[PDB]
Design a protein around this ligand. Structure first.
Ligand code: MG
Ligand code: MG
Ligand code: MG
Ligand code: MG
Ligand code: MG
Ligand code: MG
Ligand code: MG
Ligand code: MG
Ligand code: MG
Ligand code: MG
Ligand code: MG
Ligand code: MG
Ligand code: MG
Ligand code: MG
Ligand code: MG
Ligand code: MG
Ligand code: MG
Ligand code: MG
Ligand code: MG
Ligand code: MG
Ligand code: MG
Ligand code: MG
Ligand code: MG
Ligand code: MG
Ligand code: MG
Ligand code: MG
Ligand code: MG
Ligand code: MG
Ligand code: MG
Ligand code: MG
Ligand code: MG
Ligand code: MG
Ligand code: MG
Ligand code: MG
Ligand code: MG
Ligand code: MG
Ligand code: MG
Ligand code: MG
Ligand code: MG
Ligand code: MG
Ligand code: MG
Ligand code: MG
Ligand code: MG
Ligand code: MG
Ligand code: MG
Ligand code: MG
Ligand code: MG
Ligand code: MG
Ligand code: MG
Ligand code: MG
Ligand code: MG
Ligand code: MG
Ligand code: MG
Ligand code: MG
Ligand code: MG
Ligand code: MG
Ligand code: MG
Ligand code: MG
Ligand code: MG
Ligand code: MG
Ligand code: MG
Ligand code: MG
Ligand code: MG
Ligand code: MG
Ligand code: MG
Ligand code: MG
Ligand code: MG
Ligand code: MG
Ligand code: MG
Ligand code: MG
Ligand code: MG
Ligand code: MG
Ligand code: MG
Ligand code: MG
Ligand code: MG
Ligand code: MG
Ligand code: MG
Ligand code: MG
Ligand code: MG
Ligand code: MG
Ligand code: ZN
Lengths: 151, 208, 99, 138, 124
RNA sequence: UAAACUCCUGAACCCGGGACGAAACCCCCGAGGAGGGGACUGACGGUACCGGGGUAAUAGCGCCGGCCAACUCCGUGCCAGCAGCCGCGGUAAUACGGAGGGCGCGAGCGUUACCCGGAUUCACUGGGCGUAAAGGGCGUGUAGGCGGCCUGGGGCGUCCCAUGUGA
RNA sequence: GGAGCAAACCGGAUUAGAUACCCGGGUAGUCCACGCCCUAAACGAUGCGCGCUAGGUCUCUGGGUCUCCUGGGGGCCGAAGCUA
């Protein structure tokens, strides 16, 4: 029962004798506004239906987000082949400065202070996957010494 | 100066009850209580989800219209905050509250903020002795925001002070209702304030 | 103080004068890499004791002639013709660039 | 003839770790020991020692790894998330004390050759010295 | 490229040419009309646009578009050049300022008088 | 709530008062020195400012199809016009023109001009080259650039402290 | 130097036309010697060198007591990884 908000909804189509049939797509993101967040992309022959699907996929997928009084723990360069995105911790009272896409993501991640920017490609779809796989790479102080401990 | 134009009108656009007025805004009629929808031939129609921009915009406009102050000066203070250290967001609000014509409102001397500008401008008010008429003037901590001698026995001054009996106000403030004067104890913590505006969005907007 | 440069002789073909090549190195103002450039100075040598290829020291001095405001200080080492080569070879290459 | 022994060395680790090897060798050298010395001081490798290869001095660098992982494709965690040389043979990078970088907000380390030894980012800063930024690790 | 290649060759500095030879920096340039005539728009359109060649003080000679509805420019009307091309018309890279010199403003226009040089009326 | 209407304050305007900026050089005691005392001099200006009386007392401009905050009606009918781009207008235009309403900013609001930004679109930080623009037709080798393992001397680079300079 | 082939060129056919595809004939050229030209889808459309990172299969070539180990080439499938 986390918070929910879509990113965008396109209307791809297919060619075929006589005419062209469509299939709408919708990107959506979920989060409690505190570490728990997930993204989902759902395709379906109709608008509200495609959202409904995205809903299940979004709540399906999910990732823990090591917060820090509203900010992230450290910066990360994450290249999803085509696109590239970089995050960077900010002192409280800064804000969530980013693109339309990575804004919603981090916003539902309970974030309130972060420096970011998109490079190379800017495809909203690809940018999404980049931000997700970015947070998934985040590592708290504990997580580091935990793996480096190995005792 | 401030937009003299209809003000109970804005309450409707913002979608939030706004006490630009005084007695009437508190009565069953801030304008919004009768028409909870925005102005315009429309407004009574199904709106659409605003862009991240529209939202960050409609949030800033709220805070600006509240203090009913020039966009120029407003933006100047937002920057003023970014200049200094500390949490920019709250501090911005802190300087808005430190404004003189504002304190007169938060000290009860006036029923309205725009009315507060009136008195202050006409020099009815005073600080430590000087008849400061600059609605601007950043009120430093520890200052006598008294009332000028000639202005002490004013008709509209009394009605305000009489109704301002008892009633706790401004934790960061004090008020000598007898001698007609108050004090700016300290800078108002974000926790001490409470406004319909989310400062975090207002910062994001001036990030552009 | 009077600037001083370690550099090698590369032209003893003058009267009471000798040309000295001096190489300096420093980080690129932008790319940081260590680049190496140089310049030739004419040094006053009334004794003519300093022959070709002699690595010597030079000093900012009273103006002697039009293009010559330095004097020799002291030899550092004799056999250094390999370095004079690098200079003379560079010259030979110039001849094979024009038309 | 190679160029920078250090570069290929760090490469050996990177290449090996990605395939999850027990350990790998690398020609012996004072400087490489120092690298691994600090590379173990902060704990990135299990250790090392002078090993032979048909009369040739090498160095066994026993790699370190994370726990096994659940979910699709059980990829072990990497103790060496990333490693890369900074001061290359093409461009010599020298930094002053109050210039030394902070590798991923402290979570990382910046091995660099000081005029008084070989130190980490925090360690060099502490002693109050600068030197050739060899590389970073995190 | 290598660092060396950069050290030697270096990065080529970008340089852009001005889409408008109005002057050396002048916001506007005065010039007298010569020809004044309606020309057809390009590919997707057709609407006989009011344009005019104008021999500049700067010895030049260029065509400029006349905005708004109608005008009063003849074979000797002076005028100002604003400068702003028109995708619909080839070769026209300059606009003409209304309400200045022999260039009269637009009559009967209510909205956006500034752009079309019309003094604000009085309803009374 | 906008106006109408009631109340309150009171810019402007009038009366009176009215500067700081000036303390020396210059006069005595002493010694024309040190140290104390004494007198002229204000263009700005009867302005600033202080006190008394005192009338509700200018609003404009851009924009509202998407980017981009802000919607409908009428006229028009690829015409008249719009435009920064994508584009709009060939009877039903939120894209043209007028109106109502709205959004933005207010003694300013818009346009043109040039500069940096966005442009990681000259890329040191921070790009590329199988087919997208891009590997020299292939060699040989000159300059230059780059260079393996161990010990030692100098200390050119590099790093550190002090000091001068950095008005 | 000149057999065969063959731009240009001549003729037959085809076609509305047919400077072309198809047929008959035919020149420079192709060939050699010396000299010059210096281009190309001069293509792996992939600069050269060094070090790293699973294997499976067939093939050329070399050394070794040898149902296979080892070094150098040429191919196909494919770990991780890269990739629009
Ligand atoms: Mg069809
Ligand atoms: Mg890429
Ligand atoms: Mg929270
Ligand atoms: Mg784009
Ligand atoms: Mg994680
Ligand atoms: Mg984590
Ligand atoms: Mg453990
Ligand atoms: Mg208005
Ligand atoms: Mg309404
Ligand atoms: Mg701040
Ligand atoms: Mg609170
Ligand atoms: Mg001589
Ligand atoms: Mg030179
Ligand atoms: Mg001379
Ligand atoms: Mg001389
Ligand atoms: Mg000698
Ligand atoms: Mg050991
Ligand atoms: Mg004419
Ligand atoms: Mg006329
Ligand atoms: Mg007027
Ligand atoms: Mg009112
Ligand atoms: Mg009224
Ligand atoms: Mg009235
Ligand atoms: Mg007077
Ligand atoms: Mg008086
Ligand atoms: Mg007086
Ligand atoms: Mg007087
Ligand atoms: Mg007087
Ligand atoms: Mg005086
Ligand atoms: Mg005297
Ligand atoms: Mg005397
Ligand atoms: Mg005297
Ligand atoms: Mg005397
Ligand atoms: Mg004197
Ligand atoms: Mg005196
Ligand atoms: Mg008088
Ligand atoms: Mg009064
Ligand atoms: Mg009025
Ligand atoms: Mg009134
Ligand atoms: Mg909109
Ligand atoms: Mg018409
Ligand atoms: Mg524009
Ligand atoms: Mg239509
Ligand atoms: Mg319209
Ligand atoms: Mg428009
Ligand atoms: Mg630019
Ligand atoms: Mg930007
Ligand atoms: Mg740039
Ligand atoms: Mg370009
Ligand atoms: Mg090639
Ligand atoms: Mg060559
Ligand atoms: Mg060489
Ligand atoms: Mg070396
Ligand atoms: Mg030594
Ligand atoms: Mg040294
Ligand atoms: Mg130095
Ligand atoms: Mg100093
Ligand atoms: Mg100074
Ligand atoms: Mg100076
Ligand atoms: Mg013959
Ligand atoms: Mg045929
Ligand atoms: Mg025929
Ligand atoms: Mg024929
Ligand atoms: Mg034949
Ligand atoms: Mg021929
Ligand atoms: Mg031949
Ligand atoms: Mg040839
Ligand atoms: Mg081929
Ligand atoms: Mg090519
Ligand atoms: Mg090459
Ligand atoms: Mg291997
Ligand atoms: Mg095998
Ligand atoms: Mg086998
Ligand atoms: Mg072997
Ligand atoms: Mg074999
Ligand atoms: Mg093989
Ligand atoms: Mg596998
Ligand atoms: Mg794979
Ligand atoms: Mg990569
Ligand atoms: Mg694939
Ligand atoms: Zn109200």
């Amino acid at each position: 029962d986390f918070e929910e908000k879509m990113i965008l909804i396109r209307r791809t189509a297919r060619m075929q004798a006589g005419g062209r049939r469509f299939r709408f797509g919708a990107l959506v993101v979920v989060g409690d506004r505190q570490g728990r967040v997930g993204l989902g992309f759902g395709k379906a022959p109709e608008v509200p239906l495609a959202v409904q699907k995205a809903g299940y996929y979004a709540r399906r997928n999910m990732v823990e987000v090591p917060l820090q009084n509203g900010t992230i723990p450290h910066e990360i360069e994450v290249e999803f082949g085509a696109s590239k995105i970089v995050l960077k911790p900010a002192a409280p009272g800064t804000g969530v400065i980013a693109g339309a896409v990575p804004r919603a993501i981090l916003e539902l991640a309970g974030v309130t202070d972060i420096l970011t920017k998109e490079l190379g490609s800017r495809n909203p779809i690809n940018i999404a996957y980049a931000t997700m796989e970015a947070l998934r790479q985040l590592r708290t102080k504990a997580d580091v010494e935990r793996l480096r401990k190995g005792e | 100066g401030r937009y003299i134009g209809p003000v109970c009108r804005l309450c409707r656009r913002e979608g939030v009850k706004l006490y630009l007025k005084g007695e009437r805004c508190y009565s069953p009629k801030c304008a919004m209580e009768r028409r909870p929808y925005p102005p315009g031939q429309h407004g009574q129609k199904r709106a659409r989800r605003p862009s991240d921009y529209a939202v960050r915009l409609r949030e800033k406009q709220k805070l600006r219209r509240i203090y009913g102050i020039s966009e120029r000066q407003f933006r100047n203070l937002f920057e003023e905050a970014s200049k200094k250290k500390g949490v920019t967001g709250s501090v911005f609000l802190g300087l808005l509250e430190s404004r003189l014509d504002n304190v007169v409102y938060r000290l009860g001397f006036a029923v309205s903020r725009r009315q507060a500008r009136q008195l202050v401008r006409h020099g009815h008010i005073t600080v430590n002795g000087r008849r400061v008429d600059l609605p601007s003037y950043r009120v430093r901590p520890g200052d006598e925001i008294a009332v000028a001698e000639k202005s002490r026995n004013l008709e509209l001054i009394r009605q305000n002070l009489e109704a301002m009996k008892g009633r706790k106000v401004g934790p960061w403030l004090s008020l000598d209702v007898e001698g007609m004067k108050g004090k700016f104890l300290r800078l108002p913590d974000r926790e001490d304030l409470a406004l319909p505006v989310n400062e975090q969005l207002v910062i994001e907007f001036y990030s552009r | 103080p009077k600037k001083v440069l370690t550099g090698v002789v590369v032209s003893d073909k003058m009267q009471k004068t000798v040309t000295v090549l001096v190489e300096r190195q420093f980080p690129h103002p932008l790319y940081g890499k260590v680049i190496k450039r140089s310049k030739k100075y004419l040094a006053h040598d009334p004794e003519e004791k300093y022959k070709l290829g002699d690595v010597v020291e030079i000093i900012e001095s009273r103006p002697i002639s039009k293009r010559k405001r330095f004097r020799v200080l002291r030899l550092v080492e004799s056999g250094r013709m390999d370095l004079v080569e690098k200079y003379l070879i560079r010259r030979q290459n110039y001849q094979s660039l024009s038309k | 003839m190679l160029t920078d022994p250090i570069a290929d060395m760090l490469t050996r680790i990177r290449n090996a770790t990605r395939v999850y090897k027990e350990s790998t060798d690398v020609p012996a050298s004072r400087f490489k020991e120092e690298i691994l010395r600090i590379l173990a001081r902060e704990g990135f490798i299990k250790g090392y020692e002078r090993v032979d290869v048909d009369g040739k001095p090498y160095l066994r660098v026993y790699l370190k790894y994370g726990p096994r992982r659940q979910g699709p494709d059980p990829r072990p965690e990497q103790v060496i998330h990333h490693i890369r040389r900074i001061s290359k043979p093409g461009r010599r990078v020298y930094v002053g004390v109050k210039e030394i970088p902070r590798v991923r907000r402290g979570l990382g380390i910046a091995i660099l050759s000081t005029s008084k030894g070989v130190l980490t980012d925090r360690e060099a800063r502490k002693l109050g010295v600068g030197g050739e930024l060899i590389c970073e690790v995190w | 490229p290598t660092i060396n290649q950069l050290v030697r060759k270096g990065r080529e500095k970008v340089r852009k040419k001005s889409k408008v030879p109005a002057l050396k920096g002048a916001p506007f340039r005065r010039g007298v009309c010569t020809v004044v005539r309606t020309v057809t728009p390009k590919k997707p359109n057709s609407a006989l646009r009011k344009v005019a060649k104008v021999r500049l003080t700067s010895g030049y000679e260029v065509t400029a578009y006349i905005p708004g509805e109608g005008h009063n420019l003849q074979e000797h009307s002076v005028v100002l050049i604003r400068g702003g091309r028109v995708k619909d018309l080839p070769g026209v890279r300059y606009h003409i300022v209304r309400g200045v010199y022999d260039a009269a403003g637009v009559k009967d226009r209510k909205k956006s008088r500034s752009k079309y040089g019309t003094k604000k009326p009085k309803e009374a």
